Every structure is written in structure tokens, then in C-alpha cells.
Amino acid sequence: PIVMVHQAISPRTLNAWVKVVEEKAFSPEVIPMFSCLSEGATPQDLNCMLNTVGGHQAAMQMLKETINEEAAEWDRLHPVHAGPIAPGQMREPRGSDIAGTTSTLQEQIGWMTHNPPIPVGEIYKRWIILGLNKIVRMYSPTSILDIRQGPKEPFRDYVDRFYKTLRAEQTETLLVQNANPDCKTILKALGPGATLEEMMTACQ
Amino acid sequence: PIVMVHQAISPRTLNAWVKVVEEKAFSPEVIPMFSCLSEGATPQDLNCMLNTVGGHQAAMQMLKETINEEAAEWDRLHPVHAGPIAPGQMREPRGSDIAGTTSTLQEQIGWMTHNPPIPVGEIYKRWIILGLNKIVRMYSPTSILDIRQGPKEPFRDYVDRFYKTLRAEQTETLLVQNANPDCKTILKALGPGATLEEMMTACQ
Amino acid sequence: PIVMVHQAISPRTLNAWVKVVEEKAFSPEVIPMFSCLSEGATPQDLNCMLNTVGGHQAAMQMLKETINEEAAEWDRLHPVHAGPIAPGQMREPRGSDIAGTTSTLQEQIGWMTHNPPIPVGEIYKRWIILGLNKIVRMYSPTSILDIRQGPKEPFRDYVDRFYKTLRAEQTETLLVQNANPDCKTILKALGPGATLEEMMTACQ
Amino acid sequence: PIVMVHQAISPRTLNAWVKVVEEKAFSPEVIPMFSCLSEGATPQDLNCMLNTVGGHQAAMQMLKETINEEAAEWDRLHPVHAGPIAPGQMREPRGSDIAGTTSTLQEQIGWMTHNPPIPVGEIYKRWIILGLNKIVRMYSPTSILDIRQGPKEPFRDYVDRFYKTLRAEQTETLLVQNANPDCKTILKALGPGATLEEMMTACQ
Amino acid sequence: PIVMVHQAISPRTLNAWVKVVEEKAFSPEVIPMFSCLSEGATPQDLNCMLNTVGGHQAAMQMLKETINEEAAEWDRLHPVHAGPIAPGQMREPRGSDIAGTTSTLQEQIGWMTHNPPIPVGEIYKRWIILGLNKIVRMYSPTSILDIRQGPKEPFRDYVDRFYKTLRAEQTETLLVQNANPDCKTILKALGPGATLEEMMTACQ
Amino acid sequence: PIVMVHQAISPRTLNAWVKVVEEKAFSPEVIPMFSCLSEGATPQDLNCMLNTVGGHQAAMQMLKETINEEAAEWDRLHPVHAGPIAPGQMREPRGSDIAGTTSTLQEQIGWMTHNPPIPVGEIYKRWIILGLNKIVRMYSPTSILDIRQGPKEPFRDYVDRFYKTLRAEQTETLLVQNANPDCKTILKALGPGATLEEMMTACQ
């Protein structure tokens, strides 16, 4: 990462990420973890994070596909002049450079710490997150329509499932509709505009 | 966090927080842990802490609601001038900026390290803690009225339960009332103004 | 802590303390651990240490009581001038300021790093330790009078129990008296002034 | 590593690598881990990484063989002048120097931090990775031709196996061919040019 | 420790020591560990190490006794002038100051970083090690005279026990004498002056 | 270690080493680990590493013997002038000084950071490694002559055992000779000059 000087990604960071993906798979909270562990990361750093994941290769291939789509759109909006670059001068990044596949770390650092910056790390991270969001939505096991409160399920546990699902598929009305009959009666009686807090206290 | 320069949240910090919320849920001591792990945090840092929590999504939604209430009150007391901001100058933060949803890290650092500072990290942390306090009180399993000393419960174990409950629901009189008959006799005989220490030694 | 600049308490430190209190409860060695983990700590730091403890709330309440007693005595000996403080100047700390309940971290740092210093961290730590000492003595399970060497207990194991107890309740004569008959005979025969080393070798 | 000054490889780094090779053997993701843990490494550092591996000595011998092949090719393209080197001057590296077997750390640092640099760490790392790639391909247990979707295997689990295999042996057409009859029917009906995402949603 | 500036003992260091004493008790290697973990330590640091040990209070009392003996001898050889010390000047350390019981950390740092230094940390560490050596010898379970090679004990395992014992009680002749009859025959036949290496190869 | 300033050996480093020797004993990879963990170490540092090992005291005694042999040879080649050394000047190291038994850390640092340096850490490390190599060879359980491929042993597993053994005892011809009849037939048919890679692919 660039913290301005460059510092190698730490083994602690790498290991934390790889373990999260191992334990959580693609639960929604994995995206914030990725974003939080990669602050100021270069494209090379980001590729270390993705490439050290051993499992989930279907997902990782989908991710490459999304990245390639964004890289091709980058090339469309920002064509680079073909031909020998000015001796000693910073060149223009193309999509594959931003994605760190055809750029060196030295070049990435140069872009990222230039004045003004070409924020290749930040641009790449956006493409990755776009791809991760698709994966999170795909691996969500259950439709929000199928999250319904059980006959003996505490309201809080139901609300946990409801919002966990909503977060993945990435409301209060459906929330009341999908509640069991005893809670629904209480909830409807609350009237319009009840906060979640008021609903949860009511069905406690 | 801002320690003045900015430093990325550490994986150790993130992991510690996420594990606390996993193991303790919303026991009262989680609030001091949050406050202790987020010293000098920016709004982006604080959002990393909240967003990496995978479970308890009912609570996390309640928390968003409280934050939105405080953000709307911030907007009421401190309206921001609409229109193109002065070239190169620091803009005024609105509620969503303080909450880090419509502000960049660069802007947060600028506010927080300005002279004088606009302490957006400290303002946001107060809103979060206000929200966490409501959650702690909601998830408290038992009324202080129902914490009563068992027939064969050591006084110390009862006092532990009593003050643990009190802390969550966020005294000595109720304490004596809820004691068992053998201890209550001893306690009443102590007279008024006994310290906890004296009561505990008496019923040992 | 102040190490002169301020640095946030580390998660490692916090976690170490919380685990010690979990595993050891209030065994005597917990006090030196507290003192060793909080070197140069501000009142805010010290409160993080105490407040993140989840259990033992009877003890933690006793501790608050002792702190309040010391704070009231501080106020007695060092009254603070009431009224608007001199613009831009350092104010006098009262008891609740030293205890970090009515003071900000900024003020604590100012006091602690002033010339000469008002050592609020060191003053508060003394009050806490005074309170912890009372708790250690209260939670000591057994009277030194009841630590007696078993018929088949090795002398070393008995001496371990004897001094562990003594440390908590916070000698050689009682030590010999409480020894079993076979060791007592050997010990008495040693004569006066024997070192612990000589006694232990004799009963080996 | 060189981070410009030299810093010893960290025990954390060493331990992380040795554990990866223990747990993952030569699964493909081990190569990115190696590359990510050895950023800016000297030849001495790289040799520490390889030499501390206790098992897999067949692989480690194959790796030495590949390194020796690259070192002999280096000598072919870049012969070094034989005879006493200029007093106090930097000498030319031969293959065994780059591989760190006949060079000192001091010399490696000198080459790597010279102007312009002789990037011996980067050159050696390329030879190692070339060797590791051969090993990964050799230890791949199964031909991509034998990765076929089971009758009751979810499409996602099959795609995971397919791309994990492809990565090791280091497509969509074979992917559809090797699918079970129920998914193949759906896939063929999608028409040409379907993304992985579309195929996976279709067979979900 | 003093590394010249002072730095607080680390929780990692403290925890490592306390765990060693827990797991190894007073096996001989504990002394080198103590010495290695306390490099440049002040008396306060050293007291943190000793005082955080929860068990073995017989040993810890013996250790205090030895320290007091050395402190009284220090006072004998280096009496301190009684009376008000020169305003603002460094005072002379007595035994209890070196042992850190009547000296502040500030004073210890002053002594240790003075020109020339009064090396109170190094002097105290010597007294502690003297005390630890006595404890190690006391807790050695078995006489070197009783370490004899079993009928089916491999020579290497016997030699391990022999030198482990010797280290605690703190040779080749006894080594050969205590060997079993089959090895003794081989050893005697080696002649005088055999290295351990030669003996071990012979009885392999 | 000297990194130029001196820094105390880290508890992490110490603990890593002690654990390696516990788990691996004297498997060959322990030597590279020792060398990698002790970069720039002083003689005092190296002695911490050796002395904190609790087990294997036969080996540790053999190691002392080898060190003493090298120290006596050092004294033979580099005699030190006897008599009072020049006030304030650096003295000449003898063997026991290099081995850190009669030298202080201060003197070691002085030698190691002098211009030109007397590299006592590097000289001692060579003696230790010489001693460790003898131990590794002694504790190798099996002759390379006895490493033969089992009737149903995969070729790769056999090659692993063969090179692991070779490394300890510290080839392709013996490799083919010791192979089982089915692989030997294939191997012989490969002709001369086959790489390990080609042999392993052939017998896969």
C-alpha cells in the first residue's frame, strides 16, 4: 500500500483476508472487510488479495470477467496514444494496467503518487467491488420472500434473518407481512411509522 | 485513525472488534470496547467497524436508524449553504458527511485536522454510542426486578448478577430487598450507609 | 499512554488485561499485571482497562466506591476555584477529572505533559490499586490459619499454598507451626534463623 | 528485503510461508502467496523461504534443477570477465550469484541498490516462479478432461472444481460439454456468448 | 527497558515469561529465557517479570530472601550519605533502590542513562539470577548419581537425561560408568579422550 | 541483532526457534531456520537461541564441544597480546570472546560495528552451523542405502523420502537402482540424462 511511501502488503493482512474468505465465503460482510483491508492498496496489492484465495474459483472467474468488462469500458472512454512514449515520462494507463496485469509496481506507484494522481488503486478497487457485489448477490441462499417468522421463532431472530438476507440480495411493510400471526397482530396495532426499535420492543 | 497523520485501521483492531461482537453479542462491556478500539477514528474507520459485523443485522439496522435520526437533527441545527463551493476550500459537513456516507476519507481528514477542527469522527462516534446504548438496553435479558438471590446462592454471585443487570438496563436498597432471608437479616442489621464492601464481608 | 507524545492503548494490551481478569479473577498477581500493562496511562486509558471487564461487576462496583472515596478526599485537600477559567489556560483538576469522568483526553494529556506535570494518570492509578487491593483481600478463599500441611503433602507444595495465601490476605513461625509432624520435627531441630531455602532442603 | 535500506526477513513471514506449504502443498494459490510474501526480497531472503521447507524434497530438488538451468542460460547470455576485479568496485553477477549461492548479502544489497540497479532479487524470483509453475502442474491430481458434473452435483460446485483444475494445469465450451444432462440442456439453450454469471444463474 | 530512551515492557514479553514459568516451572532453560527477555531492563521492569508470576510462591519467597541478602551486602560495601540530598542532583542508590522497591522509574532511568552510568538494572539482574540458580538447583528432581542408562534405553536418550540433570544440578567418566553393560563395553574399548560425538556414534 | 544500531532479540524470534527445535528436533531444515532467524546476531543473541532450548542436551553438549574446538583453532591462528590493553581502545577477541562467554555485549557491538569490523557474530555463527551440521547427520534415522521404493509406493513419495534422507546425511543413479521393478523398467528405458521432472512424469 501507499501510506507518501510504498509499503509491502503485510502477511497479517493477507492471512486475515484469506481466512475471511475461507470462513465466511461470500456473506455480505466480506465486501466491507475487503475494502477495509485494502486501504491505499496498489493494483499489485489487490491482485495479491484476490490471487491467494484457493477456493471459490467459479466466483474468482466471474470476478475476472467483470474486471475485463470494466477494463474494456475504460479503454473505450480513455484511449491511450499508441507509439514510443516520451523518454523518461509517465505513460497513460490502459485498463489492463489499472488491473495490474500489464503494469509494474513501479509504474503503479508513479501513477498513484503523481501530481495530480492517476488513482489506479482506487479505480481498480471499484471494479473489484462491483464484481464482488454480483457474487454476493448470486451466493445469497434465500429469497427475501421466503424469510418468514416461524410459529415459535422470537421476533429478534426473525428480524436478524430478514435483514441479513436483504443485505445480501442487496421493507418494514414486508417485514410485518412475513411476521407470524401473533406478532403481526401486535405490529399492525402499532400504526404507521413505527421504528424498528418500537416493533422489536412490542414483540419482545 | 488520526494519530498529526492518518493511518489505516489495523487488521488486529478490526479482528478484535468483530470477535468481541461475535462472542459477547451486546453485553454492556461491548460499548467501552468499541470506544477504546476507535480512538481518533475517522467516519470511514467507524464504518469499517460496524460494517464488518456479519450477524446481528436487526441491531445493525436499528443502529442505522438512530444514526439517521441524529444526522437529520444535525442538518436542522447546522444547514449547509447550497451551491458550488469556493474553489479549493473546505466545505461544510452535513449529517451524511459526518456519518461518512457522502464524504471521502480525504475530506474527513481535512475536517478532522483543520484549525480549528471540525471533529467529524468524534461527532459520529457519539451518534453510534447513542445507538449502541439503545441496543444494549434492548438485548438485556432480565429485569433488575427479577434478579433475586437464590436460597443457596453465595452473596457475591448474586451481587455480580445484580450489577451486571443494572449495567445493561443502564440500588443498595433494592439490593437488600432482593437478597435471600438469611443475608437480608444480616444486611438490615448493618444499619444505614453500609458500603458494598461491608455488605459483602457481612454475608460472606 | 504517554510515551513525549500520546499513543492510543493497544488492542493487544486491552485483550491481555481482559483475559487475565477472565482467567485469574482476582488472584494477587493480577495487581502487578494491571500496573505493568498501564505504564504512563492516562485516566481515559485506565478507564478502558476497567470498563472492558464484563464479569465481576460486584468487584467493579466496589472499585468505583473506593475511587469515589479517594476523589472526595482529593477535593477536600485540593479545592478548585469556582468560576470561569482564564481564557486559554490549564484548569485545576478535581477528583472526577483525575478519575477521568469529567475530563477530556486533551485535558489529561495537558496536565500530564505540563511543566511541572500534574500527574493525573499516576494519581488515579494509585486510587485504583488501593481499590484492587481491597478486592484481592476480599476474594482470598482461605485464612492463612487454615493453610496446614497435609500428612502426605510435600513440603514444597505446602509452602506454595502458604505464601500464595499470605500474598492475597496481604511468618516462618506460623509456617513451622502449620507444618505436619514429620517436617515440624525436622524444622524445630534446625534452630532459629533458618532461611526458607534451608527449611525446604531439610524437608525435601 | 530491501524496503532504501535492508531489513531481515521477519519470522512471521517465514512462518507464514512454511505453514502454507505444509497445509496447501502445491495447490496453485501457493505461487501468488510466494510472490506476495517476498516483495523486494534479496536472493538470501528467497533461499530462506525455500530452504526452511522441510517436506516435499522431490519438488525442492526439481526446483533446484530449474534454477540451475536458468543460471546456466544467464551465464550464456551474460559472461563475466575472469580475473581480479577492480579494487573497491562492484563485480558482475553470474548465475550462481543471482541464485545467492556464491554471493554475499552485502553484494546482493549492492547490486539491488545500485544506480542503475542489477535487480538480482527480481531475476532470481522469476527463475523460482518458473520452477514452481512446473511443480504446480505436476502435482495437479486430475485432468481437466476428467472434471465432469455429477448427476446431483450443484452447478456451482462443478464450476469450482473445473476452474480450480484449470488453474493448476495452467473453456466455456468444455465447461458446457462436461456439465450433466439437465444443465447442459439449459446451457445450450442460452445460445453463444453467455457469461459465466449467466450460466451459473441459469443452472441454479 | 532502555533501548537511549525508555520503553515500557511489552505485553508480549510479559506474557511470554509468565507462560514459560507456567509450562517449564524451574527447568534450567528458564534462566536463559529470563536473561534474554530482560535485556536493558530497569528494576521496575524486572519486578514486573517476577511479580506477575502467580504460582510457585515458595520459590518467589526464596528469591526475595536472596535479593535481600545481596541488597544488605550492597549496603555494606556502598553506604549512602544520610541527609538531604543536593537540590536537583542524582542521589546514591542503596540496595532497596537497586531492587526497585524504594526507587522510582524516573530515578532508575536517571541512574542507568547517566555518565558514567550506575547500572542498577544490570546489578539487580545479577542478584535475581543468583537467586534463580539456587531455585533451579533445588527443584532438580534427581541426582546425577541416579541417572543410569536403562537395559533397553537408546544411548542418545540416556545422554539427554544425563546432561539435562547436570545442567540443573549445575563427567564423561561418570557418563561411561552409568551406561548399561553393552554400551559400557563399547565405550571402554574406545580408549581415553573420546568426544561425545564419538561415544554416541559408537553406541548408536 | 545489529540492524547501524543494536536491537534486543525479539520474543517472537526466540519463541519461533525454541518451537522449531521442539517440533522438528534436528531435521535438516532446522539449520536454515537457525540461519534465517539470526541475521546480524551478536554472540550474546546466538547464545540466547542455543541456551533457551530445554531438551536435546546431548546434542547441545556436542555443540559446545565443536564450538570449543573452533575456538581453540581461532586462538592458534590469532593469538592475543597478553597484558593491560591500551586505555580506551578496542581489544583483540579470543575464541571465548567470539563465542560470547568472556565478552560483554558492549564489546561485541564494538567489534561488529567497528571500521573495519571484526565480525564476531558471523564468525561464531559459522562455528555453530558446523556443529549443527554434525548433529543433523548424527540424528538422521536411516541410511540412503535403505531408502527403497515400496511395491505400492507412489514414485513421488519415494523420491520425497530419498531426497529428505540425502539432505540429512548431507544420486539419480542410486535413485533408479532403489526404485521398484515397475518404475525401474520405465526409468531405465528413459535413457541417460533424464531430469528429475522427466522421471517423475514417467512414473506418475
Q: Is the bond into B43 cis (omega within 30 degrees of 0)?
A: no
Phi, then psi, of E6 in degrees rounded to 5: -90, 140
Q: Which residue of B has its CA nearest to C135?
A: B197
As a whole number of angstroms, the distance between CA D111 and CA D125 comes to: 15
Whether the Cβ atoms of residue C53 and residue C60 lie closer than 8 Å to each other: yes
Placement of cell 451466493 in the chain: A139
3-state secondary structure of C3: coil
Are A55 and B33 a contacting pair, CB within 8 Å?
no
Q: D119 and D109 in contact (C-beta within 8 Å)?
A: no
- From CA E88, how far away is CA E80, in angstroms rounded? 17
| Beta-ladder partners of F2 | F6
Inter-chain contact C52–B40, Cβ cutoff 8 Å?
Answer: no
Q: Which residues contact B31 (CB under 8 A, 6 or more apart)?
A: B129, B132, B133, B136
Hey, is the C-beta of E60 within 8 angstroms of any chain C C-beta?
yes
Q: With beta carbons less than 8 A apart as the criterion, state whether B135 and C28 touch.
A: no
Q: How near does any CA of chain A get to the CA of D101, in Å?
A: 26
DSSP H or E run through E45:
helix E43-51
D19 CB neighbours in chain A (<8 A) are: none
Burial class of E128 by CB neighbour count within 10 A (0 to 12, 13 to 18, 19+): buried
Q: Does B143 touch chain A (CB under 8 A)?
A: no
What chains are in contact with A, requiring at least 3 Cβ pairs below 8 Å?
B, D
Q: Are E39 and E75 in contact (CB under 8 A)?
A: no
F12 in contact with D, Cβ within 8 Å = yes
Q: Is residue C196 within 8 Å of E65, Cβ to Cβ? A: yes
Chain B residue with minimum CA distance to C56? B160
Tell me, yes or no, whether E106 and E128 share the same domain.
yes
What backbone phi and psi angles, to 5 degrees, belong to D164?
-65, -45
Q: Least CA distance to B30: which residue of chain C?
A: C52
Among E8, E9, E138, whose Cβ lies nearest the Cβ of C3? E8
In whole angstroms, give the CA distance from residue B44 to residue C72.
41
**Same-domain pairing of E96 and E183:** no
In three-state secondary structure terms, E2 is strand
Whether residue C135 sits in one domain with residue C149: no
CA distance E189 to E193: 12
How many residues comprise chain B? 204
| Cβ-nearest to D160 among A12, A57, A65 | A57
Report CB contact under 8 Å: B61, A196. Answer: yes
> Sign (positive/negative) of CA torsion C40, C42, C44, C47?
positive
Rg of chain F taking only CA atoms, in angstroms: 23
Q: Angle at CA D93, nearest 5°, toward D87 and D94?
A: 125
C109-112: list long-range contacts, CB under 8 Å, 24+ apart. Answer: C109/C2, C109/C6, C109/C42, C112/C2, C112/C42
Q: How far apart are CA C121 and CA C2, in angstroms?
A: 10
**Does E53 lie at the interface with C, CB-CB under 8 angstroms?**
yes
In angstroms, the CA F58 to CA D98 distance is 39
CB F99 within 8 A of CB F30: no
* Percent composition of chain D: helix, strand, coil (DSSP 3-state, to 5): 60, 0, 40
Please enumerate, as own/partner, the contacts of A14-22 that have beta carbons within 8 Å and a separation of 24 or more: A14/A48, A14/A49, A14/A52, A14/D16, A14/D33, A14/D36, A14/D37, A15/D16, A16/B11, A16/B14, A16/B15, A17/A49, A17/A52, A18/A52, A18/A53, A18/A54, A21/A53, A21/A55, A21/A56, A22/A55
Q: For residues A197 and A117, state if they share a domain.
A: no
Q: Which of D143, D162, D194 is the last residue of a domain?
A: D143
Q: Can you tell me whether residue E19 is helix, strand or coil?
A: helix
C-alpha cell belonging to residue E142: 534427581
CB contact set of F52 (below 8 Å; sequence gap of 6+): E29, E32, E33, E36, F14, F17, F18
Residues D121 and C148: their CA atoms lie apart, in Å, by 68
Please say whether the beta carbons of D26 and D56 come within 8 A.
yes
- Looking up cell 500527574 gives C119
Q: What Å distances lie between residue A186 and A154, A183, B59, E104, CA to CA?
A: 14, 5, 20, 66
Cα B18 to Cα B23, B52, C56, C121, C130, distances in angstroms: 9, 7, 23, 30, 34
Cα separation, A99 vs C179, whole angstroms = 77
Asked if chain A contacts chain C via 3 or more Cβ pairs within 8 Å, the reply is no
Query: What sign does the dihedral C89-C90-C92-C93 (CA atoms) show?
Result: positive
Give the domain extent around F96.
1-143
| Cα E194 versus chain centre, distance | 31
Considering the domain architecture, whether residues E59 and E122 belong to the same structural domain is answered as yes
**Interchain proximity E156–F58, CB inside 8 Å:** yes
Asked whether C33 and E52 are in contact (CB, 8 A), the reply is yes
Best CA proximity match to A106, nearest among A43, A50, A46, A51: A43
Chains that touch E (3 or more CB pairs under 8 A): C, F
Asked if D160 lies within 8 A of A48 by C-beta distance, the reply is no
> Would you give the DSSP letter of residue F114?
S
Q: Where are the alpha helices (DSSP H) in chain F?
A: 11-24, 30-37, 43-51, 57-77, 95-98, 105-112, 120-139, 155-169, 172-177, 181-190, 196-202
Q: How far apart are CA B98 and CA B42, in angstroms?
A: 9
| CATH of residue C11 | 1.10.375.10
Could you tell me if B122 and B152 lie in one domain?
Answer: no
Alpha carbon distance A96, C163 (integer Å): 71
Find where cell 449547509 sits.
Answer: B80
- Please state, in angstroms and rounded to a whole number, the distance separating the CA atoms of residues E103 and E124: 13
Do both F159 and F133 map to the same domain? no
Q: How far is CA B16 from the centre of its chain?
A: 16
* CA distances to B152, C170, D155, D170, F112 from B202, in Å: 16, 20, 69, 76, 66
DSSP state of C1: -
Whole-number Cα distances in Å, A169 to A22, A113, A138, A143, A145: 21, 37, 8, 8, 11
Cα(F178)–Cα(F172) distance, integer angstroms:
10
- Residues of chain F contacting D15 with CB distance shorter than 8 Å: 16
**What CA–CA distance (Å, rounded) separates A109 from F42?**
37
Flag if C8 and B3 touch (Cβ within 8 Å): yes
Task: Flag if B36 and C48 touch (Cβ within 8 Å).
Answer: yes
Last residue of some domain: D143, D159, D187?
A: D143
For an interface test with C, which of E10, E21, E42, E51 has the most C Cβ atoms less than 10 Å from its Cβ?
Answer: E51
Name the DSSP class of C2.
B
Any A CB within 8 A of B61 CB:
yes
- Rounded distance between C-alpha atoms, residue F37 and residue A135, angstroms: 42
Q: Are residues D118 and D185 in the same domain?
A: no
Name the nearest CA neighbour of D70 among D139, D128, D17, D150: D128
Instruction: Check B163 against C57: CB less than 8 A apart.
Output: yes
Q: Find, in chain D, the residue whose alpha carbon is nearest to that of F16.
A: D11
CA–CA separation, D27 and D164 (whole Å): 9
The domain tally of chain F equals 2
Query: Residue B157 is placed in which grid cell?
Result: 454471585
Q: Which residues touch A178 (CB under 8 Å, ≥6 apart)?
A: A147, A148, A149, A158, A162
**DSSP element (H, E) containing D129:** helix D120-139
Q: Is A134 on the interface with D (CB under 8 A)?
A: yes
Same domain, C111 and C170: no
Which residues, at least 6 apart from E194, have a Cβ–Cβ distance to it below 8 Å?
E172, E187, E202
Q: On the CB side of D51, how many CA atoms lie within 13 Å of its CA?
A: 19
Please name the residues in contact with B115: beta carbons below 8 A apart, sequence gap of 6 or more.
none
Neighbouring chains of B at 3+ CB pairs under 8 Å are A, C
Chain D meets chain B (3+ C-beta pairs below 8 A): no
DSSP letter for each residue of chain A: -B---B-PPPHHHHHHHHHHHHHHTT-TTHHHHHHHHTTT--HHHHHHHHHT--S-HHHHHHHHHHHHHHHHHHHHHSPPPPSPPPTTPPPPP-HHHHTTSSS-HHHHHHHHTSSS---HHHHHHHHHHHHHHHHHHHH--S-GGG----TT--HHHHHHHHHHHHHHH--HHHHHHTS-HHHHHHHHHH-TT--HHHHHHHT-
Query: In the numeric block, which cell numbers belong to residue D104?
Result: 554475499
Among residues D111, D51, D55, D115, the alpha carbon closest in space to that of D78 is found at D111
Q: Do D13 and A11 touch (CB under 8 A)?
A: yes
Q: Which of D143, D159, D189 is the last residue of a domain?
A: D143
Phi, psi (degrees; rounded to nearest 5) at B108: -60, -50
CA angle E55, E61, E63 (to 5 degrees): 105
How far apart are the C-alpha atoms of E172 and E184, rounded to whole Å?
12
Do E138 and E150 fall within a single domain? no
Query: Where residue C202 sits, what CATH number does that domain have?
Result: 1.10.1200.30
Distance CA C183, CA C188 (A): 9
Which of D36, D167, D204 shows the shortest C-beta gap to A48? Answer: D36
Q: How far apart are CA D30 and CA D52, in angstroms?
A: 15
Element housing E156 (H / E): helix E155-169
Report the residue count for chain F: 204
- Rounded to whole angstroms, the Cα distance separating B1 from A183 reads 43
Residues 6+ apart with CB under 8 A from B128: B34, B46, B50, B63, B67
DSSP string, C80-121: PPPSPPPTTPPPPP-HHHHTTSSS-HHHHHHHHTSSS---HH
CB spacing of E163 vs F62 below 8 angstroms: no
- Chain F residues touching residue D62 (CB < 8 angstroms): 195-197, 200
C61 alpha carbon, distance to own chain's centre: 16
Residues from chain F that touch E156, judged by Cβ atoms under 8 A, are: 58
- Describe chain E by its helix, strand, coil percentages, rounded to 5: 60, 0, 40
Gap between the Cα atoms of A80 and A76, Å rounded: 10
Deposited experimental method: X-ray
Best of F23, F197, F203, F204 to substitute, by most chain D Cβ atoms within 10 angstroms, is F197
- The answer to whether F135 and F119 are in contact (CB under 8 A) is no
Query: Is residue C153 within 8 Å of C168, Cβ to Cβ?
Result: no
* Residue contact B48–A28, C-beta within 8 A: no
Separation between Cα atoms, residue D122 and residue D135, nearest integer Å:
20
Please give the Cα distance from E44 to E101 (Å, whole number): 8
Contact F142, F169 (CB under 8 A): no
Written as one letter, the residue type at D129 is I
A9–D36 CB contact, under 8 Å: yes
Take residue E202 and report the three cell numbers written for it: 559408537
Q: How wide is the angle at C-alpha C82 spanned by C-alphas C80 and C85, nearest 5°?
A: 90
Give the integer Cα–Cα distance in Å for A32 and A34: 5
Instruction: Give the Å distances, CA to CA, from C167 to C27, C45, C143, E51, F88.
Output: 9, 27, 11, 11, 49
Q: Could you tell me the CA-to-CA distances from B146 to B162, B177, D44, D108, E47 in Å, in that order?
A: 9, 11, 68, 73, 46
Which chain E residues touch C39 with a CB distance below 8 Å?
Answer: 8-9
| List of residues 6+ apart from D70 with CB closer than 8 A | D95, D126, D127, D130
Chains F and A touch (3+ CB pairs under 8 A): no
Residue F11 Cα to chain centre, angstroms = 21
Angle between helices D43-51 and F30-37 (to 10 degrees): 140
Inter-chain residue contact B36 with C58, CB threshold 8 Å: no
Do the Cβ atoms of C52 and C18 come closer than 8 Å? yes
Same domain, F62 and F135: yes
For an interface test with B, the pick among A155, A162, A196 (most B C-beta atoms closer than 10 Å) comes out as A196
CB atoms within 10 A of CB D99: 24
CB < 8 Å to D54, chain F: 24, 27-29
Amino acid at residue number E161: R
Q: Which residues contact E195 (CB under 8 A, 6 or more apart)?
A: F62, F65
Q: Which residue has the cell 533457551?
A: F52
3-state secondary structure chain B: CECCCECCCCHHHHHHHHHHHHHHCCCCCHHHHHHHHCCCCCHHHHHHHHHCCCCCHHHHHHHHHHHHHHHHHHHHHCCCCCCCCCCCCCCCCCHHHHCCCCCCHHHHHHHHCCCCCCCHHHHHHHHHHHHHHHHHHHHCCCCHHHCCCCCCCCHHHHHHHHHHHHHHHCCHHHHHHCCCHHHHHHHHHHCCCCCHHHHHHHCC
Residue C126 CA to residue C149 CA, distance in Å, equals 36
Resolution to 1 decimal, in Å?
1.9
Q: Which amino acid is at E117?
A: P
Contact E138 C1 (CB under 8 A): no
Q: Which residues contact C146 (CB under 8 A, 6 or more apart)?
A: none
Enter the DSSP assignment of C129.
H
Min Cα separation B160/chain C (Å): 5
Report the sign of the C-alpha dihedral through residues E53, E55, E60, E61, in that order: positive
Q: Is C136 on the interface with B (CB under 8 A)?
A: no
Angle between helices E30-37 and E11-24 (to 10 degrees): 170
Whole-number Å distance between alpha carbons of B140 and B26 = 8
| Three-class DSSP category at C6 | strand
The one-letter amino acid at E146 = D
In our burial notation (b when 16+ CB lie closer than 10 A, e otherwise), range C143-166 reads ebeebebeeeeebeebbbbbbbbb
**Cell numbers of F198, please?**
522427466
- For residues B163 and B114, state if they share a domain: no
- Direct distance between the N- and C-terminal alpha carbons of chain B, in angstroms, rounded to an integer: 47
Spatial separation of the C-alpha atoms in residues B194 and C1, rounded to whole Å? 36
Omega within 30 of 0 (cis) for the link into F43: no
Spatial neighbors of F152 by CB under 8 A, at least 6 apart, are none
